[PDB]
A = this chain, B = another copy of it.
């Protein structure tokens, strides 16, 4: 079962992001945050830190009480279709509730 863990991302010019990593067990599949341009995340391990490279993001709007907000979904490098699909399903399941 998919879990979520707050995780820091970084891209060009040292711009960082905070977001949710979606993972299993602990293997990261994807990262959701509020900015474009992130290239990698610093992923907890024991340990310690593993750098996980990200694919260019999927921007998508969700409705919110303050109006539409743009989210950015980043799949991890080399992720397979089984896991890409699980990530999309998990995000779909979360988005439909809010």
Contacts and interface: CB of A to CB of B under 8 A. Distances in A.
Interface string A77-98: 0001110111111111111111
Number of copies: 2
A61 B63 CA distance: 24
Contacts of A90: 92
A56 interface: yes
Contact of A81 (B57, B63, B73, B89): B63
A54 to B, nearest CB: 11
Interface residues on A, range: 20 to 34
Nearest to A89: B92
A97 B89 CA distance: 13
A55 interface: yes
11 contacts: A60-B84, A61-B84, A62-B81, A63-B81, A63-B84, A81-B95, A81-B98, A85-B93, A85-B96, A85-B97, A87-B92
